[model samples]
Target: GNIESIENLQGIRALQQQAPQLLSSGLPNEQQFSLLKQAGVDVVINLMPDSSKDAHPDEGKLVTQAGMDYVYIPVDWQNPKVEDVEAFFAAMDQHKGKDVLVHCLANYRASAFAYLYQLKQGQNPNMAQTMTPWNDELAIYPKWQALLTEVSAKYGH
Candidate 1:
């Protein structure tokens, strides 16, 4: 049931729309990567940690076979690093104009990074905020809140 779309992708949660050439979503299995290939995705920026129990161990090879550039940031969910975000921005900018899919487990990290990236690109704050999912549970995490605040402050969002 996994399918790719501008607004939604089967088996992917918090799928965000492409602002010309960017998309974000939850983890995709091998089959779904093929679907993404068919959908014209040329790059995949994975924010999931390699050690994550649910992460695909061979994603780099899988994505390359699918004909997409693969970038792994290995975000630390408990303590995201500024360097990771900087690298994400670099990778994203390097692939500008190409269809790119940035994802992580449940899209929490992906969306958070996407939100910050969008702000850096000059998107409206309110609009960028909608690209990620929100819940009372996640909202209560001080670390997560701090990350959001940090990004927003950095970009004056």
Candidate 2:
């Protein structure tokens, strides 16, 4: 797939002061990768499967070579099962307290993982109460919310 330039996508210049973790989608060209690196991005998470010849690769190697964590969570989009979401959360727990960068091919998948991860983290281990991580931006993705709600119960997160 040809890369679609995001008219709204702008460089995060303010990130220079703070080593803000960058979360991005998997579809990136050399130009986007360069700009993101210049913006002081520490890590780039690749959420796409290794099915596309044109998919992101150099970005991962570049981030690693730059001495940053490059994580890849290849979620199966076709059947996005309960275990997949749980496995993603498990990975998140492993990287807890570390500044992370998470991304999928179109940001939608990335958002889903981020949303669920946050929600699960807020859950009480003792089941005292239900944890809900709310974000105004997530309202733009109602379907993701539904999945999060369903999965939280399914996995008892």
Candidate 3:
């Protein structure tokens, strides 16, 4: 069921195409990448942003060599800002019409970004509650919410 456990992304849309957004915990291996290629995923979005991990560079190179677009967006959990959202938006714009696989550690950050992107794109608020942060590890949502409110007031929603 999970992309990492499975050989490749199953249930990908044949008409729409889908890239498997992987969790940072489970890095895709060479075989997985090959399977992704065979499944018709032309782009791989890597959201893992740990600067100390040189693993990114090697995997990134391998991803490119596999003939797929690789986008790396480093998201700071405690201080995610509108700029980060903008960066993701820019990448999505650049990769317009192409199937995108967005990923990050735990999928929480990715889910947050997904909700924001959906909000910006005029999607209904069915998934809007997901935009709210609920961090149990660092107790960060209150701070992040305050920042969002302050930024939105200054920048406008």
Best by TM-score: 1
lDDT of 2 by residue, 1-157 (tens): 8657654465431111111342534465556655655656555666677675546555567666556667666766554656767767776666656655565555556656665665566633321111112224445556555666687675544
TM-score of each: 0.86, 0.59, 0.63
In order, what is each prediction's RMSD in angstroms? Answer: 4.4, 7.5, 6.6
Per-model lDDT: 0.80, 0.55, 0.56
lDDT of 1 by residue, 1-157 (tens): 6554754434556677646677888888888899889988999999998899998879999999998889988999889877888999999889878899999977778877877888888876454355446545466777877877776777764
Better of 2 and 3 by lDDT: 3
Itemize residue pairs with steric clashes in candidate 1.
none
- Candidates sorted on lDDT, descending: 1, 3, 2
Model 1: weakest 10-residue lDDT segment is 127-136
lDDT by residue (63-137, candidate 3, tens digit) is: 888888888878776667778778887888887676565655445556555655655666533333443233353
Model 2 scores a TM of 0.59
Cα error, residue 90 of model 1, in Å, equals: 1.0
